[PDB]
Design an enzyme around this catalytic site. Structure first.
Site, PDB file in Angstrom:
ATOM      1  N   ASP A  16       4.552  26.145  21.509  1.00 39.97           N
ATOM      2  CA  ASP A  16       5.577  25.746  22.460  1.00 39.97           C
ATOM      3  C   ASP A  16       6.899  25.382  21.769  1.00 39.97           C
ATOM      4  O   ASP A  16       7.971  25.579  22.330  1.00 39.97           O
ATOM      5  CB  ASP A  16       5.083  24.603  23.335  1.00 39.97           C
ATOM      6  CG  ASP A  16       5.673  24.650  24.716  1.00 39.97           C
ATOM      7  OD1 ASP A  16       6.011  25.766  25.177  1.00 39.97           O
ATOM      8  OD2 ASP A  16       5.802  23.583  25.347  1.00 39.97           O
ATOM      9  N   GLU A  69      11.133  22.954  27.595  1.00 39.26           N
ATOM     10  CA  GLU A  69      10.342  23.122  26.370  1.00 39.26           C
ATOM     11  C   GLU A  69      10.605  22.003  25.377  1.00 39.26           C
ATOM     12  O   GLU A  69       9.662  21.377  24.889  1.00 39.26           O
ATOM     13  CB  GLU A  69      10.596  24.485  25.684  1.00 39.26           C
ATOM     14  CG  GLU A  69      10.637  25.713  26.602  1.00 39.26           C
ATOM     15  CD  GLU A  69       9.296  26.089  27.211  1.00 39.26           C
ATOM     16  OE1 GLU A  69       8.372  25.260  27.197  1.00 39.26           O
ATOM     17  OE2 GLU A  69       9.171  27.215  27.737  1.00 39.26           O
ATOM     18  N   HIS A 104       8.234  19.138  27.535  1.00 44.03           N
ATOM     19  CA  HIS A 104       6.947  19.594  27.007  1.00 44.03           C
ATOM     20  C   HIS A 104       6.653  19.059  25.615  1.00 44.03           C
ATOM     21  O   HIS A 104       5.555  18.565  25.372  1.00 44.03           O
ATOM     22  CB  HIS A 104       6.831  21.123  27.022  1.00 44.03           C
ATOM     23  CG  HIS A 104       6.860  21.720  28.396  1.00 44.03           C
ATOM     24  ND1 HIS A 104       6.831  23.079  28.612  1.00 44.03           N
ATOM     25  CD2 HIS A 104       6.942  21.144  29.620  1.00 44.03           C
ATOM     26  CE1 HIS A 104       6.879  23.316  29.910  1.00 44.03           C
ATOM     27  NE2 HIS A 104       6.945  22.159  30.545  1.00 44.03           N
ATOM     28  N   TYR A 155       3.419  16.588  24.618  1.00 43.04           N
ATOM     29  CA  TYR A 155       2.370  16.906  23.641  1.00 43.04           C
ATOM     30  C   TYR A 155       2.274  15.808  22.575  1.00 43.04           C
ATOM     31  O   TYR A 155       1.180  15.371  22.214  1.00 43.04           O
ATOM     32  CB  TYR A 155       2.622  18.267  22.966  1.00 43.04           C
ATOM     33  CG  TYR A 155       2.245  19.478  23.797  1.00 43.04           C
ATOM     34  CD1 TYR A 155       0.954  19.619  24.310  1.00 43.04           C
ATOM     35  CD2 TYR A 155       3.168  20.506  24.045  1.00 43.04           C
ATOM     36  CE1 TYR A 155       0.594  20.728  25.071  1.00 43.04           C
ATOM     37  CE2 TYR A 155       2.814  21.627  24.811  1.00 43.04           C
ATOM     38  CZ  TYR A 155       1.522  21.735  25.306  1.00 43.04           C
ATOM     39  OH  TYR A 155       1.139  22.823  26.060  1.00 43.04           O
ATOM     40  N   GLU A 183       3.912  32.842  27.402  1.00 42.85           N
ATOM     41  CA  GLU A 183       3.908  31.992  28.601  1.00 42.85           C
ATOM     42  C   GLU A 183       2.699  32.191  29.516  1.00 42.85           C
ATOM     43  O   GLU A 183       2.161  31.222  30.072  1.00 42.85           O
ATOM     44  CB  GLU A 183       5.179  32.230  29.429  1.00 42.85           C
ATOM     45  CG  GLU A 183       6.493  31.963  28.687  1.00 42.85           C
ATOM     46  CD  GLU A 183       6.911  30.495  28.677  1.00 42.85           C
ATOM     47  OE1 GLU A 183       6.164  29.621  29.151  1.00 42.85           O
ATOM     48  OE2 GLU A 183       8.013  30.206  28.209  1.00 42.85           O
ATOM     49  N   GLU A 189       5.041  26.787  32.560  1.00 42.13           N
ATOM     50  CA  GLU A 189       4.901  28.047  31.796  1.00 42.13           C
ATOM     51  C   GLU A 189       4.637  29.242  32.717  1.00 42.13           C
ATOM     52  O   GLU A 189       5.127  30.346  32.461  1.00 42.13           O
ATOM     53  CB  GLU A 189       3.817  27.961  30.709  1.00 42.13           C
ATOM     54  CG  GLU A 189       3.772  26.639  29.881  1.00 42.13           C
ATOM     55  CD  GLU A 189       5.044  26.315  29.087  1.00 42.13           C
ATOM     56  OE1 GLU A 189       6.154  26.773  29.432  1.00 42.13           O
ATOM     57  OE2 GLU A 189       4.938  25.556  28.109  1.00 42.13           O
ATOM     58  N   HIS A 241       7.946  30.228  34.105  1.00 48.46           N
ATOM     59  CA  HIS A 241       8.710  30.816  33.002  1.00 48.46           C
ATOM     60  C   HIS A 241       8.293  32.268  32.783  1.00 48.46           C
ATOM     61  O   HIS A 241       9.142  33.165  32.713  1.00 48.46           O
ATOM     62  CB  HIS A 241       8.546  30.028  31.697  1.00 48.46           C
ATOM     63  CG  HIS A 241       9.037  28.614  31.754  1.00 48.46           C
ATOM     64  ND1 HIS A 241       8.823  27.722  30.725  1.00 48.46           N
ATOM     65  CD2 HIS A 241       9.715  27.932  32.711  1.00 48.46           C
ATOM     66  CE1 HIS A 241       9.359  26.554  31.035  1.00 48.46           C
ATOM     67  NE2 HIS A 241       9.899  26.652  32.238  1.00 48.46           N
TER      68      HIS A 241
HETATM   69 MN   LIG Z   1       6.500  24.589  27.122  1.00 49.47          MN
HETATM   70 MN   LIG Z   2       7.697  27.962  28.699  1.00 47.25          MN
END
Ligand SMILES: [Mn+2]
Ligand SMILES: [Mn+2]
Ligand SMILES: Nc1ncnc2c1ncn2[C@@H]1O[C@H](COP(=O)(O)OP(=O)(O)OP(=O)(O)O)[C@@H](O)[C@H]1O
Ligand SMILES: Cc1cn([C@H]2C[C@H](O)[C@@H](COP(=O)(O)OP(=O)(O)OP(=O)(O)O)O2)c(=O)[nH]c1=O
Ligand SMILES: Cc1cn([C@H]2C[C@H](O)[C@@H](COP(=O)(O)OP(=O)(O)OP(=O)(O)O)O2)c(=O)[nH]c1=O
Ligand SMILES: [Mg+2]
Ligand SMILES: [Mg+2]
Ligand SMILES: [Mn+2]
Ligand SMILES: [Mn+2]
Lengths: 683, 287, 287, 683
Positions: free
Chosen positions: C51, C82, C86, C90, C149, C183, C186
């Protein structure tokens, strides 16, 4: 910037470290002298003004013709004899911008406050000149405030319906759904809020005519209702408002709640429809024990038992439904559902929460039906019977749809005048007149239930204002003591007036014989418990007023047994949103949200301090968000023990309160007997 | 020492133009003279162009060359705001107030306006001149970006603020204030990155970089004067706006760690007035 | 025909890591075996690493080469998600479940892992090969992006969804579900941009681009099978994970306007539970 | 992949540079032998099969009770004696996937083609064994195809209505709008398509009860109707489809058209509602002269004149409306509106175009009413009268809605059997029976109009197929000559059958005496003009068949004057899409879209060559997109001169065509007497 706005804006300009509260009297004086006296249509005498108003299709001539012009002149003189003065700019502004009669071009003011009050009193009296004068004194003293519909529309040819709260039962059929949409549009056209019960509709994925997975569930009907309410927007000035209620044990409950999620897809979102959930004690018991619960498909239950799921006692039928293979159910987590409800109420303030067992354990008309849902304001709790709308050319089976016309006692003014009994009885008479003069031509069940039940809603307002203006904390035990005594007296005198009306007219409400009033089970706590104030400070506030005792309640119980009761429902505490400004009173029995209310009208902003706000009582005007919601729940439960209907109960939450705090507040409200929870307001 | 707090500030400032209903401006707009409406449309169109290039080019290219995932996250967020939020908000305003033909005409007008083309040419040229691993070309582009954020927008911002301060076009004005609040923090952040690079240089190199910054500012300033006169002469405000842009030029210099260049002046006071989820435990069911 | 619609769907899906409280996951994490904890850590690091490439290179490089202001804005928004949302999400999951030293070791391992590296570098290679004004090279990169994705993430997403569907690690599973939902959109959006390029090509060039896409899919798929056995054999799930990879490969192909490559298979129910205007000329009226 | 599907896919595999058309016969044979025979339930005899079907709630026992089992056996033997074989895989696939009765689990096949034909014939005969045998011969010979609703549902207990096309007039009131929504939902629940006329609704910004700017216009009602159709989507098996029609002179025309713009906001955009425009000759005249035009507010016109705008003659009342100060109107550019229609049709295929004056210059029932709108397929053109739905407990003024049951002549089979007269008369009898046995108990206007007007629609299909298989170009003058002669004969025999039915039953349709049939004005062109083929090649096609002459038409005119007509409307060419595969025919009278049809069923792609397609007739099977739309308009106008209702006319456009070309096609169709234009299909 007008001069009155400049004076009002001086409120927030602190001088000597304190707000200039005296600028509001100057602000209102300037507002009047420079706008209202100038923009008031001039008439030589009352006769010319009345003739002009009737001729130009302003005033209905039906109610005015019942009085000789001498009587009308005497009533109008009585209204003006008080020399009533608006104490703050906001009250007069609200009256002359919302309720004062204005020419068709909306450029001139035809009605003063006294003229509006006199017209409303003449409408109420129905030909009784002395009754009209009593109504004029009641309203000019601001002891009783008719609801916004009745107050604004009474005596007006263009007027809409004087009733504004409607509850509709929807039967599980396309004919019934179409009729519900039509009736909702018809009632919204009249400007009244419409609440629908969707618990009888079968869940999504149920069979239509032995064709499985055909039903769209309650969310498709909700989309239809949302579009109908959007279309009937009442000229668009006030967008069409509708509420849908669903039982928590309905299968579609999760989808029902998902319509209010911001992340929800637009094809599922319902923008204009408020949602309430009906929670039986069984669900709370299941969540408390962390047991796995089931949501049932209503049509399977109806087929198995020949009765609707929401027509049955879930506390007695839940185990039978679970153990019955012919009943279709899916498992849910009751605690997860409660957390989802709290999260949704935090995000959007929805859904309204109705505690069904709290409502029905004190309901006097369970024989007619149990209370299955509430209204758009969450305070109407009455028995309803669903209608059976059949095919064209087939006779319909008209049931009972709930409606009530609203009125509010001004607690501060009722206590200052020591006129609880007289004010309550006059308000009951006015509400009865409004109910008797209502005839809905496109809501057969609403009209039939209005004729049969004669339900009225007598609320109260200015509880927090009265308490703060008397050195009493809202959350304090003394506040609850006063509320207990005052609302016990209100219930006593409303019951006495209902029984007296039944005796005078010789008729009770339909199915009164099976009610708890007839059997005397209603008066058990009143004949066994004394509700006099337990604090000397509170007992002194009631000095000069007779507080009913257990002997008085025994006498009233015997009188009711002899003569019955004219109203199936008498008391409900509605929000009383915009009419509180005119009365210079706090809204309903809720605590104030802000000490000083800052609002922008046009391009100029206005400041409204809470009525009676001053340095001495500044600390007693504690804001709701700063209050312990447990104490607010305690106060509302104290009041609710004397209200036969519900109370619009808004939860005022700080942004730092987690969903667990909201869940605990709801659980404490259910524990304390709270019937409904209206809104979750976050600061 | 600062990226995390800028990250938090940027994400907490997140907004969309749709949050603000614009139909309330319909009447105060209708009431403006043709000259006033023309200047207003053109002003916002000039802003739209700047944000278009700041979002498409300026912020992404600076993000590419700046090291560190958190610094890149802030710059990426700022880039998104430029073109997905700011540039788009102007179209929300246009679509509310103006008929399609007037909207079409103003976008045609940006393409042919010589001052707007010159300022775009100069700023975007510097963005596209950045060379990988060459901190000096990066510094020059960051100076250009600070000048766009903290100086160039302000000939445009003046007019919505001027109306907001008189209680006119207040919904559009609310959008503009949100945009301005964002650009102020964008200018500070990019300014701090520029100072990092400047502080690595010899005294001789620093002297050249100050020359670059001041020469660029003067060149942009002279062009902005002509742009300002072109837009504001028809509404009688050119001299007032000029004072405002000089004020903001000083703020841009300060964001770069440099001394103010223009003398202080009184700005129109109207414009100054224009400025959780936790689970339920068993004990939660007992009281 | 589609960018404004995707703009709307993207911005209305906006979310932040802070919204989900993570600490309550420790109440199920402590009850997993060593192999389960090991697989989860490795999968999570795999997703994180892939990612990051998408945030630093994949989305910004596509935004750079695509023409159109509105497309650049949507692409900027996706790049922001992202890097700003994201990546932080994470990191938050990791910091909650493992101590600092364990996180560093897992990332060292996954960074050296042959199957993770093979796919990461294959995708990055195609992004690095985009040439200015060459729509063929852009298309190839878009195919790579859609494969990441809509396909490559799913051998990883399987495990959090598997736990999420069982009532385990619900807080991090909710986060993963939000990421996955981003995702998905995307992949669909970049897919539409690739189809636009594809549709501008000759029939011979189309056949050549189809061969490219299928060949690339085959290379990635064969490596996914090895990646899958390497991670999931120790927890006995590889057979079902393989079905999930093929199902998502078919979705990726459909995003690119291509036919499904693999036969339809049912998916593990636990994972499922987790988841030309011209004017009339006055003669057209006469005949 | 199924073996039959592999055989079918071999169609496209060129061998010797030629398509392997013979592979479809092998494909159909393999399909049968490997799937249909295997999955066909086994019954020892017909008696056992009938008992199983009746007891298991598959068939309606009432209609089968009118025959002794000997007669039912004879009818079934008649159906089976033909040994009918499907000529292509797609025909059998379509029949056994859509119309063949299957067990409740949709696992086995209970009906073959012969069984369905026999059941339909027994349902039609209504107890007549010889008539049932005649119907069996007609259907098994495939000379006549009952519409999909009748063919699928006839004789089935769990069936929808046999009529599937309804037209609803909507009056300008909330009661009427709510009733329209309810009726649309009731009719879509039955599977029928619903078309609503919105021209009587007042435009946006009109007054509601002397309060100005209160009306939402036709777009709000359109949103209501779109949600209603989405909700009543036939249990999900077929999304609810509805059409809305607005006169071009309605003020909401631009807002009405904008609901179909792709860029339209989701709030205004209507997704599942088809839209058609009714264009009077006045609008075309205004656009032709480039004069500024006006769109009127319907309620102002109604108040000024007491009639609705669409109830008046626009060609005469347009100038009066423009010159009336009490009529509100909005200036428009007629050519800009025409170009907007062309661009909207190019982008989405909408709106449908109804040329009102073309429809009504030949309309036989203008005394009952003018034709104001069309159906969801744009081939229904009948007089309608709006209903007045009043408040509850009041009496509703039920008007006349529109509905016709459809059937299609198979032109190729009718011409091969030389049975135009017999086929037309039998189809008329079957359609009359379907109309008589139809009763909608939730659409009072629809039921009343069905009982009063007795309207049927007898369509035709396989025109292009029949012409191509006979070496005639669709665009050739010979094709138009054949269409003229064939449809003149069809009209002659349908009129004769209607007169014979009226004589037998001694009853005509309501208000027949005022129709052009009664006065004889209908037969003017038939008694004065000859319609026998002008080409020897076409004249040979009719060898062995009597072509009615002017003397025959005079005799028919005298017969009708003596006995009257049973049907107000008889002929309408509906699109006839799904059942064209079963009949192995080209859809309706339109030219083929593609010589070989590529379809996807599951993961298997099926190839369908045009029926009768071969190497020697490849050139005559010209695709519609390659034809001159002017020649297609000429063909449809030649056919339309013998159809009392409309012809569903789709325009097939190439992507290179501009909006000017579409406008020219529309203007030529209006010039050539075209009544409606269905779709603008682009390649
Ligand atoms: Mn992502
Ligand atoms: Mn993405
Ligand atoms: N606060 C107020 N609320 C309502 N009406 C007001 C108020 N202030 C003024 N008015 C109206 O405006 C009139 C003029 O107000 P003003 O205070 O000047 O009266 P005045 O001549 O002093 O005597 P009075 O108070 O008896 O009217 C009042 O008679 C009353 O009709
Ligand atoms: C007709 C129809 C009904 N419904 C829902 C709404 C009603 O609450 C429910 C029942 O429909 P009904 O109108 O009562 O259908 P029915 O009575 O003929 O069939 P049954 O006796 O089996 O109920 O189905 C749909 O969701 N979609 C539809 O199209
Ligand atoms: C009630 C209502 C009507 N309408 C529209 C739909 C109807 O076609 C039109 C007329 O409504 P009506 O139901 O006819 O209202 P009315 O008869 O009481 O008023 P009037 O005497 O003027 O006829 O108004 C709305 O758009 N919104 C609404 O809320
Ligand atoms: Mg039913
Ligand atoms: Mg009306
Ligand atoms: Mn910006
Ligand atoms: Mn910026």
């Amino acid at each position: 910037v007008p001069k009155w706005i400049q004076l009002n804006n001086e409120i927030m300009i602190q001088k000597d470290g304190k707000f200039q509260f005296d600028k509001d009297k100057e602000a209102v004086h300037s507002y009047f002298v420079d706008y209202i006296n100038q923009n008031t249509v001039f008439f030589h005498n009352l006769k010319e003004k009345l003739d002009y108003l009737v001729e130009n299709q302003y005033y209905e001539e039906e109610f005015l013709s019942l009085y000789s012009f001498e009587d009308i002149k005497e009533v109008f003189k009585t209204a003006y004899a008080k020399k009533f003065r608006f104490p703050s700019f906001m009250s007069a502004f609200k009256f002359y911008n919302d309720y004062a009669l204005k020419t068709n071009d909306k450029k001139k003011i035809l009605e003063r406050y006294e003229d509006r009050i006199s017209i409303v009193a003449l409408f109420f009296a129905n030909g009784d000149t002395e009754k009209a004068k009593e109504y004029v004194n009641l309203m000019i003293n601001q002891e009783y405030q008719p609801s916004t519909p009745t107050f604004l529309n009474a005596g007006r040819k263009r007027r809409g319906e004087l009733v504004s709260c409607f509850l509709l039962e929807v039967n599980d059929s396309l004919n019934d759904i179409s009729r519900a949409i039509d009736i909702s549009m018809q009632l919204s056209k009249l400007g009244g809020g419409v609440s629908l019960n969707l618990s009888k509709l079968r869940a999504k994925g149920e069979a239509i005519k032995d064709v499985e997975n055909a039903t769209k569930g309650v969310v498709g009907v909700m989309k239809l209702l949302d579009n109908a309410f959007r279309y009937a927007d009442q000229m668009g000035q006030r967008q069409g408002s509708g509420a849908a209620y669903l039982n928590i044990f309905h299968r579609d409950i999760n989808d029902f709640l998902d319509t209010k999620k911001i992340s929800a897809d637009e094809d599922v979102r319902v923008k204009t429809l408020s949602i309430g959930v009906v929670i039986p004690d069984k669900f709370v018991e299941l969540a408390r024990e962390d047991k796995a619960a089931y949501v049932f498909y209503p049509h399977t239950i109806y087929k198995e038992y020949g009765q609707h799921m929401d027509e049955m006692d879930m506390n007695e039928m839940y185990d039978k439904f679970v153990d019955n293979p012919r009943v279709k159910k899916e498992k849910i987590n009751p605690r997860k559902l409660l957390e989802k409800l709290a999260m949704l109420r935090s995000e959007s303030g929805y859904p309204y929460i109705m505690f069904q067992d709290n409502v029905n354990k004190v309901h006097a008309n369970n024989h007619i039906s149990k209370v299955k849902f509430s209204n758009l304001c969450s305070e109407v709790l009455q028995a309803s019977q669903v209608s059976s709308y059949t095919d064209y050319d087939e006779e319909d089976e008209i049931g009972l749809d709930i409606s009530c016309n609203l009125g509010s006692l001004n607690i501060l003014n009722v206590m200052e005048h020591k006129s609880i009994e007289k004010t309550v009885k006059l308000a009951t008479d006015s509400l009865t007149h409004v109910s008797e003069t209502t005839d809905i031509r496109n809501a057969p069940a609403v009209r039939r239930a209005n004729k049969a039940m004669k339900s009225i809603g007598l609320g109260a307002m200015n509880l927090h204002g009265y308490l703060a203006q008397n050195g009493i904390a809202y959350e304090s035990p003394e506040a609850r003591d006063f509320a207990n005594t005052f609302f016990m007296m209100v219930n006593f005198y409303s019951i006495q007036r209902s029984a007296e009306i039944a005796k005078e007219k010789g008729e009770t409400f339909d199915q009164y014989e099976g009610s708890t009033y007839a059997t005397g089970e209603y008066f058990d706590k009143y004949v066994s418990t004394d509700f006099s104030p337990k604090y000397e400070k509170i007992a002194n506030l009631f000095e000069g007023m007779h507080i009913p005792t257990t002997e008085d309640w025994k006498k009233l119980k015997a009188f009711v047994a002899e003569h019955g009761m004219y109203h199936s429902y008498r008391l409900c505490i509605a929000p009383t949103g915009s009419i509180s400004y005119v009365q210079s009173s706090t809204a309903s029995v809720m605590p104030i949200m802000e000490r000083i209310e800052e609002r922008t009208y046009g391009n100029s902003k206005t400041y409204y301090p809470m009525p009676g706000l001053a340095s001495n009582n500044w600390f007693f005007y504690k804001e709701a968000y700063d209050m312990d919601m447990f104490k607010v729940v305690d106060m509302i439960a104290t009041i609710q023990q004397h209200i036969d209907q519900g109370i619009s109960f808004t939860l005022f939450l700080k942004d730092t309160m987690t969903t667990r705090d909201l869940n605990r507040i709801d659980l404490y409200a259910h524990h304390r007997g709270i019937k409904t929870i209206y809104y979750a307001r976050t600061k | 020492d600062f990226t995390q707090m800028f990250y938090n500030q940027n994400v907490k400032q997140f907004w969309l133009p749709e949050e603000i209903a614009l139909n309330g401006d319909l009447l105060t707009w209708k009431y403006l003279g043709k000259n006033e409406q023309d200047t207003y449309m053109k002003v916002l169109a000039g802003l739209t162009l700047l944000d278009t290039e700041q979002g498409n080019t300026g912020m992404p290219i600076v993000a590419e060359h700046v090291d560190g995932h958190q610094r890149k996250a802030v710059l990426n967020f700022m880039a998104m705001m430029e073109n997905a939020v700011h540039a788009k908000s102007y179209s929300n305003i246009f679509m509310t107030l103006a008929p399609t033909e007037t909207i079409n005409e103003v976008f045609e007008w940006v393409k042919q306006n010589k001052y707007l083309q010159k300022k775009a040419q100069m700023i975007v040229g510097l963005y596209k001149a950045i060379q990988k691993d060459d901190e000096i070309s990066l510094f020059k582009a960051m100076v250009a970006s600070v000048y766009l954020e903290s100086f160039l927008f302000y000939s445009g911002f003046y007019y919505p603020l001027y109306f907001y301060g008189q209680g006119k076009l207040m919904q559009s004005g609310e959008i503009i204030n949100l945009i301005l609040r964002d650009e102020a923090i964008h200018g500070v952040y990019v300014g701090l990155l520029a100072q990092e690079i400047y502080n690595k240089q010899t005294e001789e190199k620093k002297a050249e970089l100050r020359e670059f910054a001041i020469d660029l500012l003067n060149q942009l300033y002279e062009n902005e004067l002509e742009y300002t006169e072109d837009l504001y002469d028809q509404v009688g405000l050119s001299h007032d706006v000029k004072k405002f842009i000089r004020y903001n030029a000083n703020k841009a210099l300060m964001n770069l760690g440099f001394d103010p260049y223009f003398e202080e002046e009184d700005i129109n006071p109207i414009v100054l007035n224009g400025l959780t989820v936790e689970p339920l435990k068993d004990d939660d069911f007992y009281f």
